[PDB]
Design a protein around this ligand. Structure first.
Ligand SMILES: CC(=O)C[C@@H](c1ccccc1)c1c(O)c2ccccc2oc1=O
Length: 363
C-alpha cells in the first residue's frame, strides 16, 4: 500500500455518528488515536442526551485501517491502501429476534486526522427487547447463568439428592436396585484404582451435587477459566454418564427413570458448555469483491444479556474505495479483535471508553 505509509505512527481518530433507532434520534461524537504498528485503538465516545441503545451494540459501527497486518500479509491490507481518499463501509446488522441496524460510513483522511462519519438507522425493534430495554451487560463479572442452565443444574441437584435419600435410607423401587450396585459408588471404578478405603470412593450423587453446583456457579462467570473448567467437567460427566448408561442396559437390564433424566441433563450441559466455549469469536471474515473493487465481510457478535443469555448480532459488511486510484484486493483472511470497554470517572455525559486490539490472521 501507498496509503500504508500514513499509518506508521500514531494517527488521530475522530468519529461522528448520526443515528435514528425506531424514531429515537441521537448523535455520538468520539475521539482518540490509533497505532497500526501494534493494532491498538484508544477512543472515547460521548452521546452528544442519553443513548437510546446499549453501547456494545455500537462498538462495531464506531476503523479497520488500524488493523495490524503482519509483514507476510502486507499485500492483503485493503483498508490502508484505500487511503488517503478513504472508503465507504456499509453494514447490515441483524439482531436475532429483534430489529436491524443499517449503517453507512465514510472513513477517510481529513487533513491530519482519520475521520469515520457514520449514518445509522435502526428499524423493527420491540420497545421491551434487549436493545431498547437496555438488558445488555457492559463489562460485568458476576452475572446470571440463564434459566436454562439454572433449570438443568437445579433439576440434577434434586435428582442426585434424591438418589442419596434413596441409598442412605412416584414409584421408584426400580431405582435403588441400580444405586445399590457396585457402580453406584465411585462409578464402580474408584475401588479398582484407589481402593475402596479412599475418601474419593463416594456415592456418585456426591459427584452429582458437586458437579451441578459447580456448573451453576461457573455459569455466573464471564471469564475463560470457568468456561474451560465447565467444558472439562461436563466432558468427564458425559463420559461417566455414558459408562453408567452402558451399565444400566445390557448389563443390569434394569430401567430406572432418574438415570435417563440425568443422562439427558448431562447431555444438555455438555452441549451448552461446548457452545459457550466455541462461540467466543470476534473473527471478521474478509473476502474480495472484484465487481466493486472492494471487500465483503461476514461475522457474528454475541452480546451478553443480563439474564445470562446471549443476544446474537449478524454482521454483513461492504467496503468500496473512494478514489479511482489503485487498491489491494486480498485473498480470504480474517481479523482477530479484542475490545475492552470501560468508563471515565471525570465524565458525566453518557459515554464509553474503548480500548481495542486487532491483528490480521489467516492467509
Ligand atoms: C441420578 C444420579 O445422579 C445417579 C446416576 C448418575 C449418573 C451420572 C453421574 C452420576 C450419577 C447413577 C446411575 O446411572 C447408575 C447407573 C448404574 C449403576 C449405578 C448408578 O448409580 C448412579 O450413581
Amino acid at each position: 500500500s501507498k496509503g500504508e505509509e500514513l499509518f506508521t505512527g500514531v494517527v488521530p481518530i475522530l468519529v461522528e455518528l448520526d443515528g435514528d433507532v425506531n424514531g429515537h434520534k441521537f448523535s455520538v461524537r468520539g475521539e482518540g488515536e490509533g497505532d497500526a504498528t501494534n493494532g491498538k485503538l484508544t477512543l472515547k465516545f460521548i452521546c452528544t442526551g442519553k443513548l437510546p441503545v446499549p453501547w456494545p451494540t455500537l462498538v462495531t459501527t464506531l476503523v479497520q485501517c488500524f488493523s495490524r497486518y503482519p509483514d507476510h500479509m502486507k499485500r492483503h491490507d485493503f483498508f490502508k491502501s484505500a487511503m488517503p481518499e478513504g472508503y465507504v463501509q456499509e453494514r447490515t446488522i441483524s439482531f436475532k429476534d429483534d430489529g436491524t441496524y443499517k449503517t453507512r460510513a465514510e472513513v477517510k483522511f481529513e487533513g491530519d486526522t482519520l475521520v469515520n462519519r457514520i449514518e445509522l438507522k435502526g428499524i423493527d425493534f420491540k420497545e421491551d427487547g434487549n436493545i431498547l430495554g437496555h438488558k445488555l451487560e457492559y463489562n460485568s463479572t458476576w452475572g446470571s447463568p440463564g434459566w436454562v442452565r439454572l433449570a438443568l443444574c437445579l433439576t440434577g441437584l434434586v435428582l442426585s439428592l434424591y438418589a442419596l435419600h434413596v441409598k442412605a435410607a412416584g414409584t421408584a423401587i426400580s431405582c435403588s436396585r441400580v444405586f445399590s450396585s457396585r457402580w453406584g459408588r465411585g462409578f464402580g471404578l474408584v475401588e479398582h484404582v484407589l481402593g475402596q478405603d479412599s475418601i474419593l470412593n463416594q456415592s456418585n450423587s456426591i459427584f452429582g451435587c458437586i458437579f451441578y453446583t459447580l456448573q451453576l456457579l461457573l455459569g455466573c462467570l464471564r471469564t475463560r477459566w470457568a468456561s474451560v473448567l465447565m467444558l472439562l467437567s461436563s466432558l468427564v460427566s458425559l463420559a461417566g454418564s455414558v459408562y453408567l448408561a452402558w451399565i444400566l442396559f445390557f448389563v443390569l437390564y434394569d430401567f430406572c427413570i432418574v438415570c435417563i433424566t440425568t443422562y439427558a441433563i448431562n447431555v444438555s450441559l455438555m452441549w451448552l458448555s461446548f457452545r459457550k466455549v466455541q462461540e467466543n469469536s470476534h473473527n471478521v471474515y474478509i473476502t474480495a469483491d472484484k465487481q466493486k473493487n472492494g471487500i465483503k465481510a461476514n461475522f457474528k457478535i454475541r452480546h451478553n444479556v443480563e439474564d445470562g443469555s446471549v443476544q446474537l448480532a449478524d454482521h454483513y459488511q461492504q467496503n468500496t474505495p473512494i478514489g479511482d486510484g489503485p487498491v489491494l484486493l486480498p485473498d480470504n483472511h480474517y481479523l482477530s479483535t479484542q475490545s475492552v470497554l470501560s468508563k471515565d470517572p471525570n465524565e458525566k455525559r453518557d459515554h464509553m471508553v474503548l480500548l481495542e486490539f486487532v491483528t490480521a490472521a489467516g492467509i
